[PDB]
Design a protein around this ligand. Structure first.
Ligand SMILES: [Zn+2]
Lengths: 75, 35
């Protein structure tokens, strides 16, 4: 029910449509859908904190139009 | 082409090498405080 932004280290901004009840893993799956990046290679960061897969956006009180950061990880 | 580290909020100017910047960011997952 809200828009968020996901900024990559190359400077690209990805816009996403999410609900506060979406888990971080759900958000990663939306990123895979839109951009192609496998979820297990994504770190999502907000205000310097790595967001944990099983928690929700609401669990971090991330409100509408916030900017997350995407950093790739090696598996 | 300014770049921002999402972990420590340092900013990196346009001419700062992209790959070195990315390596900086990744190193925070080895050690949070780099100075
Ligand atoms: Zn940093």
């Amino acid at each position: 029910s809200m828009q968020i932004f996901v900024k990559t280290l190359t400077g690209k901004t990805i816009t996403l449509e999410v609900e506060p009840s979406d888990t971080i893993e759900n958000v990663k799956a939306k990123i895979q859908d839109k951009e192609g990046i496998p979820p297990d290679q994504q770190r999502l960061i907000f205000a310097g904190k790595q967001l944990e897969d099983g928690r929700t956006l609401s669990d971090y009180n991330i409100q509408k139009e916030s900017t997350l950061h995407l950093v790739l990880r090696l598996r | 082409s300014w770049k921002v580290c999402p972990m420590c909020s340092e900013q990196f100017p346009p001419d700062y090498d992209q790959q070195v910047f990315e390596r900086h960011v990744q190193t925070h997952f080895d050690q949070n405080v780099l100075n």
